[PDB]
Each structure stands twice: as structure tokens, then as C-alpha cells.
Amino acid sequence: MKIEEGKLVIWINGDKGYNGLAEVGKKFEKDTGIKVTVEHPDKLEEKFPQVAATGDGPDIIFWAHDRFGGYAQSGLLAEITPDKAFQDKLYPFTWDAVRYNGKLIAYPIAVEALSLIYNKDLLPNPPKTWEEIPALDKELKAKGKSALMFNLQEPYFTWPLIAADGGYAFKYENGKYDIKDVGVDNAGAKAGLTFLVDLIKNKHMNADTDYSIAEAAFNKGETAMTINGPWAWSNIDTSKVNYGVTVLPTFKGQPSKPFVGVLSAGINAASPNKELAKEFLENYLLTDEGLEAVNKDKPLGAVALKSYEEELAKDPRIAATMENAQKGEIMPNIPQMSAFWYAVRTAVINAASGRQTVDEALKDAQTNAAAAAGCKXX
């Protein structure tokens, strides 16, 4: 158990720029004598709640904002209090992503949106529609390739297709999310999941495909397309594949509607280094220099810090990131998000494996997502 007075332990996902973050932490230590240790545990977002209070948790946790409302409901995150002048440094909607029950509960870092990534050599003109993917596969198969591979095991990657024709998580009503009104079993959701299952049934994709499989396949030039976020561009760069980043395909004429994450830094409410954490995040990390260090390790996306984002906006890959983000939605941060993701994960796996029909799978998801639950689990 590693938290100590006068030091900082930080958790961040292993696909993100943790080496670049450690370098900002090295500068923080030179200036203040406060040692910064960056770790990237597996499933850090699941690990956090049970080890935050007394266990081997971090002083700071980096994850997409959707998990944070749940943490805050259990009293696990320190309220943050940036002054108006600091808040004016970041885009206003990023602060909203980390506001829960009237309070700011994390520092926004970057907007992460999924994009269509394609191999320009295999596919100089990527498809505008999901509907044309089966034919494109048949063509590419004839040449020993495949059209599209992406991570099917995480609902984050499949949601954009499910949402395209009308699927939604929770209904927004009377200025709040109605946790009893779940939209994963409506006509549009069924159409989206049906198209996905069919891709698998007709052998255009493999139901067991996961993150590492899709990444290697794309970076080794075996598949023409993948779906992934900005963090993934660094490894493609190393692979020397000639790639483009572009708008996701439409479904039934409607844009894919990814749920968009705001990478955020939360401060452990039981940390004895909360003031230290605030200083690191405000004065070191959220600066042109700090973000550049993390970004050059693994790209962050459209950063929350205006001054730096204005420099990044020149990048066509960022422009594509922003375009997909605008066609999707910043995730709700309500505690019920984890139940929602769990319901969709289960439905997608069950439908893709043939263990349930789409209709059966989604009906169950709607029921489960809506089940009442208190702040400690369920």
C-alpha cells in the first residue's frame, strides 16, 4: 500500500501516455521535492473504489469522466476548486463533464472520441456507410485481407453503431437523466445490434476480436480499417502503415453516435496530499508544456486547454476526432453508467455468440440497466 504523506501516486490506463506523465511528475519533484509515481494497473477504474479509502489506491486517478459520478456518490473524490481564471483556461463543456451534483469532482484533460482509422494503401477511399462493409470485405478477402477489425469485447466500440439509428442510454427529461427510462431496446438499438451480429454471422468479423487483435491486424496491414481513439495513433506511426483518420460510417443514413469520454483526473478524497495533487494538476499538468509531454507520448485527443488545443486543431486527425465527437455525445456521469455499460456489454456478447437473439439480449439489457441500485453496488 503505497500512498505516503509528501508523495503522489497516480493511476492511468496503460494505453495512454504514462511515460509522458511521469516526465511532468519528474519536473514537479525537482520543483517541490514531491516524488510522483505513475502506475498503470489493469482495470484501474474497477480497482479504485475498494482500495481508495484504506487500501493501496492512488492519490490521483485518470479515467474517462463517466465513472466519476459513481465515485463521487460514494464520497471517494475530493471536490476541486479551480478559480474562475483557471476555469476560463479550459472549454466550458469540459467542466460540465466533471460536474456532479453541483460540484466539480475532477480536472478535465482531453476529449476522447472514436474515429474510423483506415489503411490508405489498401483502401484509398474509406466507406461512408456501414452497409457497404460486407461487400468491401468480400473484395478484400479475395486478396487475403479483411475490411474491418475493432474491439468487440468493450461496448464503448459498438455503442456508436447501436446509437446511430436511435439507441440511447438514459432518457433526458425535466433537465435530468431518467434512470428508469433506458433506450437500449428500441427499434434503432435493435437495428444496430442486428447489423453487427450479421457481420459476425456472415464471417466479416470475429466475435472474439479484442483490442490487441484489432490493433496488431491494422498495424500489420492485414485489415483495411479499425475503430479507435487518439491514443492509438502512436503505435500506428511506429508501424509505418500509411493511415488516415476519418468520420465514422453512417448507419441507415444517420451518423454513428459514439459516447464521448473526457479524460479526467480525480483526486482521492482520502489522500493526505490533496493540496499537492491540486498543485500538480493545475500548475504542472494543465499547461501547454505539461500536456505536450503527455501528448507526444500518446496523443490525448482534443485537449481541454484552449491554448494547446488551438495548436492541435491544425492536425487533420484531431479535426476528424472533433467531427466524430460532435456527432456523438459526451457521456452522462451519473452513477448508473456502470450498470448501463454492463448491460450493453452482456447483451452484445450474448447476441454476437448466438447465445441469445438480438431481441432477447436487448430486452434483458433494458431490464437490467433500469434496475434500482444504491451507492454501494447491486
Partner 1 sequence: XXXXXYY
Ligand X SMILES: *[C@H]1C[C@@H](N)[C@@H](O)[C@H](C)O1
Ligand Y SMILES: *[C@@H]1O[C@H](CO[C@@H]2O[C@@H](C)[C@H](O)[C@@H](O)[C@H]2O)[C@@H](O)[C@H](O)[C@H]1O[C@H]1O[C@H](CO)[C@@H](O)[C@H](O)[C@@H]1O[C@H]1O[C@H](CO)[C@@H](O)[C@@H]1O
Ligand Z SMILES: OC[C@H]1O[C@H](O[C@H]2[C@H](O)[C@@H](O)[C@@H](O)O[C@@H]2CO)[C@H](O)[C@@H](O)[C@@H]1O
Ligand U SMILES: *[C@H]1O[C@H](CO)[C@@H](O)[C@H](O)[C@@H]1O
Q: Which stretches of the chain bind ligand Z, using CB under 6 A?
A: 13, 64, 66-67, 112, 154-156, 261, 341
Q: How many helices (H) and strands (E) does the chain have?
A: 16, 17
Nearest approach, Cβ of residue 42 and ligand U (Å):
9
Q: Kindly state the helix (H) or strand (E) to which residue 330 belongs, with its residue range.
A: strand 329-330
State the minimum distance, in angstroms, from the CB of residue 321 to ligand X: 35
CB of 346 to ligand X, least distance (A): 9
* Selected binder of ligand U within 338, 340, 352, 370 (CB under 6 A): 338
- Shortest separation between residue 45's beta carbon and ligand Z, angstroms: 6
Q: Is 175 left (phi over 0), alpha (psi -120 to 50) or beta?
A: left
Q: What residue is closest to ligand X based on CB?
A: 376
Binding-residue total with partner 1 (CB under 8 A): 16
Question: Which C-beta is closer to ligand X: that of 177 or that of 342?
Answer: 342
Q: From residue 33, give the alpha-carbon distance in Å to each of 12, 36, 191, 276, 280.
A: 22, 9, 57, 11, 12
Which residues in 38-97 contact partner 1 (CB under 8 A)? 49-50, 70, 74
> Shortest Cβ distance from residue 236 to ligand Z (Å)?
16
CB-CB contact of 121 with 242 (8 Å): yes
CB of 242 to ligand U, least distance (A): 38
Q: Could you write out the DSSP letters of every residue in 149-207?
A: ----SSHHHHHHHHHHTT-EEEEEETTEEEEEEEETTSHHHHHHHHHHHHHHHTTSS-T
Subset of 354-373 contacting ligand Y (CB under 6 A): 373
Give which of ligand U, ligand Y, partner 1, none residue 371 binds (C-beta under 5 to 8 Å, depending on kind).
Answer: partner 1
> Does residue 250 contact residue 130 with C-beta atoms inside 8 Å?
yes
Q: Are 130 and 161 in contact (CB under 8 A)?
A: yes
Query: Euclidean distance between the first and final Cα of the chain, in Å?
Result: 27
121 to 150, contacts with partner 1 by CB under 8 A?
none
Q: Work out the number of other CB atoms within 10 angstroms of the CB of residue 237.
A: 12
Comparison of 13 and 295: residue with beta carbon closer to ligand Z? 13
C-alpha grid cell, residue 276: 499537492
Query: Which CB, 80 or 111, lies closer to ligand Z?
Result: 111
Q: Pattern 312-351, binding to partner 1, x per CB under 8 A?
A: ---------------------------x--xx--x-----
Q: At a CB cut-off of 8 Å and minimum separation 6, what does 270 contact? A: 52, 53, 54, 57, 76
Contact string (CB under 6 A) for ligand Y, positions 318-357, x = contact: ----------------------------------------
Q: Which among 112, 175, 31, 104 is positioned nearest to 325, based on CA atoms?
A: 112
Total residues in contact with ligand U, by rule CB under 6 A = 7
CB of 314 or CB of 376, closer to ligand Y: 376
Ranges within 354-373 binding partner 1 (CB under 8 A) = 368, 371-373
Q: Which does 66 bind (CB under 5 to 8 A by kind): partner 1, ligand Y, ligand Z, none?
A: ligand Z
H helical segments located in 33-154: 44-52, 68-73, 84-87, 92-97, 133-141
Q: Does 240 bind ligand X (CB under 6 A)?
A: no
Cβ contact 32:243 at 8 Å: no
Cell numbers at 366, concatenated = 433494458
* 378 near partner 1, judged by CB under 8 A: yes
Q: Which of 30, 43, 143, 376 binds partner 1 (CB under 8 A)?
A: 376
For 289, the enclosing helix (H) or strand (E) is: helix 288-297
Residue 376 sits in the site that holds ligand X (CB under 6 A): yes
Give the span between the Cα atoms of 353 and 40, in whole angstroms. 31
Contacts to partner 1 by CB under 8 A = 49-50, 70, 74, 339, 342-343, 346, 368, 371-373, 375-378
Contacts to ligand U by CB under 6 A = 45-46, 49, 67, 70, 338, 377
Contacts to ligand Y by CB under 6 A = 373-378
